[PDB]
Each structure stands twice: as C-alpha cells, then as structure tokens.
Amino acid sequence: ILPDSVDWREKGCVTEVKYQGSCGASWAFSAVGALEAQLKLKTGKLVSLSAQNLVDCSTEKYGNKGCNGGFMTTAFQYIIDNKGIDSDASYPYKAMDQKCQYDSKYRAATCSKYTELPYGREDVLKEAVANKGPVSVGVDARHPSFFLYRSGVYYEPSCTQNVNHGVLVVGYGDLNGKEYWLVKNSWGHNFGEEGYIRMARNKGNHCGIASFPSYPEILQGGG
Numbered sequence: 683i684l685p686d687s688v689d690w691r692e693k694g695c696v697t698e699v700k701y702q703g704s705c706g707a708s709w710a711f712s713a714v715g716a717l718e719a720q721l722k723l724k725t726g727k728l729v730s731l732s733a734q735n736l737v738d739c740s741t742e743k744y745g746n747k748g749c750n751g752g753f754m755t756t757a758f759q760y761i762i763d764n765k766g767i768d769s770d771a772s773y774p775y776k777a778m779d780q781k782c783q784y785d786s787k788y789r790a791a792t793c794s795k796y797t798e799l800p801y802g803r804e805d806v807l808k809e810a811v812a813n814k815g816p817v818s819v820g821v822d823a824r825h826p827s828f829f830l831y832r833s834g835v836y837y838e839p840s841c842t843q844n845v846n847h848g849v850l851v852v853g854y855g856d857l858n859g860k861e862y863w864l865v866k867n868s869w870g871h872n873f874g875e876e877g878y879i880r881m882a883r884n885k886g887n888h889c890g891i892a893s894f895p896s897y898p899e900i901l902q903g904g905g
C-alpha cells in the first residue's frame with residue numbers, strides 16, 4: 683500500500699538545503715539530491731554530492747550548459763558513464779562554470795541506471811516517491827507567486843506544465859486536506875519553509891510537477 687503522507691527527511695535521506703546563487707544550475711542540485719537519497723538508502727551514509735562536479739563535467743555530451751541550465755536525466759547518465767561522482771566536500775560548489783576536475787580518489791557515489799516516469803501521471807509519481815525515494819522533477823517556477831512563496835500549499839492559476847526550474851520531490855501529503863508535493867528547492871533556507879515548498883498535488887499536473895520526473899538507482903548485484 684501507499685502511505686497517505688511521505689517525508690524522506692524523517693528517514694535521514696535528505697541533505698541540507700543548498701543555495702545555488704546566480705548560477706542556473708538547479709538541474710545539478712536536483713540530480714545530486716535524488717542520488718544522495720539512494721546513497722543513504724543503500725549504504726546508510728548521508729553525504730552531500732558535488733553539484734559542481736556535474737556543472738563542470740556533465741557538459742556538451744549530455745546536452746548540459748553548466749550555469750546556463752541542463753537536465754537531471756543526462757546528469758545521471760554522466761554519473762553512469764563516469765563511474766562516479768565526487769562528494770560535495772571534496773569538489774565544492776562555486777556557482778560558476780569551471781574546468782572539469784573530477785577526481786576518482788574522492789568518488790562518493792555511483793549510479794547504475796535512471797528511470798523516467800510518464801508525463802503528467804501524478805499517481806505514478808506518488809508511487810515512486812513512496813516506494814523508490816525522492817524524485818527529480820522540473821516545475822514552472824517563473825511566476826512571481828513562486829518567488830514570494832512563504833508557507834501553505836502553493837497554487838498558481840497562471841502556471842503551465844512547461845518546466846523551467848529543477849527541484850526535488852522528497853514527499854507528499856495534505857495540509858488540512860489540501861494535497862501537496864513536498865519539494866526541496868536550491869535557493870537556501872530563506873526560501874519558503876526552511877528552503878521547502880509544498881506544491882499543489884492532484885490538480886491537473888499543476889506547474890508541470892509531473893511533466894518530466896526521473897530518479898536514479900544504485901543496484902546491489904542482480905538475479
């Protein structure tokens with residue numbers, strides 16, 4: 683069965699909120715955030731992974747442009763191709779494009795595969811968040827109400843299903859009935875509720891939250 687509510691922070695699978703600054707690298711944070719949860723699920727260690735590693739190294743082969751945007755799916759493919767990603771501690775974030783400085787000596791996680799979920803299916807997103815872990819998603823976050831969000835369940839009538847900002851679904855629930863997705867942003871802890879925003883759930887793929895979801899996996903052998 684599916685829990686009525688999920689918050690992956692309760693199980694210690696979510697690192698501290700990061701602050702991307704003036705580097706359009708939300709895709710990098712969304713991808714590492716999803717992989718961090720799998721690293722903890724599979725090994726028990728919660729380590730921040732290096733978004734800067736993706737910004738510098740997951741580039742033109744993966745359709746990504748560093749501080750000018752990119753994609754969580756191909757970020758995961760780089761980690762598969764590279765056979766690792768560095769910890770954030772060892773490859774820290776500078777909010778600018780750099781030369782690739784990946785060092786395998788400090789590799790903290792790998793990725794075996796990733797799964798893309800079907801467009802707009804909030805039921806399938808719910809099941810993945812419940813049974814797999816946090817899911818990387820894009821949202822339409824260009825509207826002023828997103829930038830000003832403080833609390834409650836976010837609903838914006840002008841939102842569309844075209845995504846323009848990468849975030850991390852770490853759970854779901856309802857606020858006094860009002861169904862929401864628990865969303866980790868990368869605008870530091872002063873955005874929203876200590877860096878989190880609850881976004882309207884089951885209201886016709888609101889703000890595109892279920893448009894392009896994906897999550898990575900770390901496989902233990904096989905049968």
Ligand SMILES: COc1ccc(C#Cc2cc(-c3nn(CCCN4CCOCC4)c4c3CN(S(C)(=O)=O)CC4)ccc2Cl)cc1CNCc1ccccc1
Binds near residue numbers: 819
């Ligand atoms: C103009 O600025 C933009 C515009 C777009 C984005 C973005 C994005 C984004 C996009 C996707 C996304 N995957 N796929 C499927 C795969 C596409 N790929 C093809 C080639 O490579 C591999 C994957 C699509 C979209 C977008 N769609 S669509 C228009 O929605 O139909 C078309 C199909 C998945 C995750 C993210 Cl995150 C980011 C910025 C910069 N951020 C600005 C900003 C906005 C608000 C608040 C703060 C900052």
